[PDB]
Amino acid sequence: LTCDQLPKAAINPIQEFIDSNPLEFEYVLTETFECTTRIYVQPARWSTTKAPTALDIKGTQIMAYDFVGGPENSAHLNECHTGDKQVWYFQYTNLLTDNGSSYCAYRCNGTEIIEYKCASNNNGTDPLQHQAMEVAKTVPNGDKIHYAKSNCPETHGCFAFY
Amino acid sequence: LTCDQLPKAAINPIQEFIDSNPLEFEYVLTETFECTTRIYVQPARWSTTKAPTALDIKGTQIMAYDFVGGPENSAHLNECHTGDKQVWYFQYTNLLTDNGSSYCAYRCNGTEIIEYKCASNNNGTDPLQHQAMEVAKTVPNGDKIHYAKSNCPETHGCFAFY
Ligand SMILES: *[C@@H]1O[C@H](CO)[C@@H](O)[C@H](O)[C@H]1NC(C)=O
Ligand SMILES: *[C@@H]1O[C@H](CO)[C@@H](O)[C@H](O)[C@H]1NC(C)=O
Ligand SMILES: *[C@@H]1O[C@H](CO)[C@@H](O)[C@H](O)[C@H]1NC(C)=O
Numbered sequence: 001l002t003c004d005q006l007p008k009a010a011i012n013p014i015q016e017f018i019d020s021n022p023l024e025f026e027y028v029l030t031e032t033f034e035c036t037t038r039i040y041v042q043p044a045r046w047s048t049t050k051a052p053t054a055l056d057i058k059g060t061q062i063m064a065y066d067f068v069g070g071p072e073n074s075a076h077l078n079e080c081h082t083g084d085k086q087v088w089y090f091q092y093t094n095l096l097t098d099n100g101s102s103y104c105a106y107r108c109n110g111t112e113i114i115e116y117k118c119a120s121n122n123n124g125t126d127p128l129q130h131q132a133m134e135v136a137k138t139v140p141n142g143d144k145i146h147y148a149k150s151n152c153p154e155t156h157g158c159f160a161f162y
Numbered sequence: 163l164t165c166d167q168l169p170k171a172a173i174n175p176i177q178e179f180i181d182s183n184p185l186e187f188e189y190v191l192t193e194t195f196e197c198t199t200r201i202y203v204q205p206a207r208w209s210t211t212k213a214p215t216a217l218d219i220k221g222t223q224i225m226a227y228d229f230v231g232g233p234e235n236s237a238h239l240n241e242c243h244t245g246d247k248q249v250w251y252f253q254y255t256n257l258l259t260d261n262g263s264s265y266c267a268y269r270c271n272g273t274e275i276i277e278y279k280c281a282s283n284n285n286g287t288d289p290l291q292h293q294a295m296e297v298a299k300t301v302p303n304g305d306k307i308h309y310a311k312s313n314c315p316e317t318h319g320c321f322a323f324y
């Protein structure tokens with residue numbers, strides 16, 4: 001299996017992601033998205049693109065990306081600080097169940113995987129999530145995929161932020 | 163007029179603030195909240211307090227505070243990185259109108275004002291907002307209140323983030 005052959009799942013309407021906030025990452029590829037909370041935001045009233053925004057929050061640091069739909073269930077991200085472009089797909093989504101929400105999303109460079117983000121608001125207890133992670137590990141460079149919360153900083157009274 | 167005598171307005175249910183996301187600050191007191199976007203987040207499914215969170219995002223830096231209700235329409239904030247406590251009130255709110263949402267919130271130390279945050283998603287065009295700012299300026303230390311967006315960094319393709 002190669003990264004280009006992973007499923008490209010249907011993308012839920014943006015409100016279903018917003019209603020899932022906050023999420024934490026369970027499995028990631030690089031160190032970048034360890035100990036990170038995901039927040040979805042609807043488009044600003046003054047946005048001319050009317051693109052929603054994904055926020056990746058790691059302690060007191062934040063990456064933001066406006067994103068629009070592309071071909072074949074792709075998400076086309078514009079990193080808000082640099083203008084850098086990224087193309088993402090979903091392996092699966094399972095939002096707004098009786099046990100909360102989860103999904104796994106990935107970024108390819110051709111046949112190899114270069115980033116992975118499995119998110120949930122149920123501490124990784126959706127059986128689809130571990131299953132998806134085990135499939136993603138089998139594509140080239142998927143060996144890097146690992147648990148995102150092994151050594152996070154201590155909290156100071158909140159639950160999704162530190 | 164002193165800070166303790168400012169109105170303590172009724173606080174809209176949290177979902178009305180979330181539905182207003184994203185907001186930008188129009189008037190602030192210190193430099194801290196210049197060029198800042200406000201995002202409200204519902205409580206995490208795993209939060210034992212079930213407190214919502216306010217996010218103050220300034221470029222790639224973020225302050226987060228879980229907050230709960232207190233006496234006399236107060237908001238009791240817990241800054242998520244430090245555990246520091248703050249008490250806030252609303253001068254007014256005007257959420258989810260045909261021209262969007264605005265509010266002004268303030269933090270006192272007794273008779274003086276020590277921080278001010280007027281937010282909107284309509285570029286400060288609610289007439290209540292400039293009116294409220296003019297009242298807040300009249301309390302001790304209100305002379306510091308000023309426009310929050312005079313010199314913000316250039317954007318790179320997004321609208322509420324940079
Ligand atoms: C993909 O890999 C190629 C090397 O052939 C490189 O030119 C390019 O920068 C890579 N793109 C990303 C997004 O990693
Ligand atoms: C979340 O899951 C991990 C096991 O992977 C466990 O260490 C931790 O106790 C869980 N957290 C809660 C709040 O149950
Ligand atoms: C309020 O002012 C007093 C000085 O009398 C000081 O002890 C205290 O730290 C101040 N509190 C805040 C939150 O600024």
Ligand SMILES: *[C@@H]1O[C@H](CO)[C@@H](O)[C@H](O)[C@H]1NC(C)=O
Binds near residue numbers: 046285
């Ligand atoms: C927002 O308001 C200021 C005037 O206070 C103005 O400079 C700017 O053009 C306005 N922005 C838009 C998009 O209309």
